[PDB]
Amino acid sequence: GYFKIYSKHTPINLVRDLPQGFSALEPLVDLPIGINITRFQTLLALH
Amino acid sequence: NGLTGTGVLTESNKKFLPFQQFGRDIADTTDAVRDPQTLEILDIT
Numbered sequence: 001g002y003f004k005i006y007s008k009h010t011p012i013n014l015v016r017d018l019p020q021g022f023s024a025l026e027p028l029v030d031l032p033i034g035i036n037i038t039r040f041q042t043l044l045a046l047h
Numbered sequence: 048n049g050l051t052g053t054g055v056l057t058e059s060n061k062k063f064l065p066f067q068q069f070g071r072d073i074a075d076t077t078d079a080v081r082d083p084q085t086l087e088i089l090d091i092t
Contacts, residue, residue, distance in 0.1 A: 026066055 002032030050080075054091040061088045 006027050061079050070079030070090075078090055 026064065030066070 001034035001036075003035045005029045005031065052091070057090050057092070059088045059090040061090075063088055 004025075004027055006025060008028070059079060063079075063081050068081055070077050072078050079088060080091070081088055
């Protein structure tokens with residue numbers, strides 16, 4: 001259940017590809033609030 | 048309110064990150080810790 005956030009903010013100037021990086025986890029914030037372990041694909045921001 | 052043991056009060060210049068606490072060597076035994084109060088990196092011999 002314990003909802004491990006790991007958010008990141010990245011600078012972006014590409015059309016369909018992504019970059020590389022190297023080493024394991026960092027939770028920018030970490031808090032046990034109780035969810036199901038099934039999904040992860042960054043969510044929306046629009047106008 | 049704490050892992051007592053033996054060593055010497057020995058300042059270490061390692062650079063943690065604000066989400067890390069412990070330390071681990073080849074043998075997976077603690078060496079480097081961060082104090083729970085004053086943000087101090089120290090080693091155990």
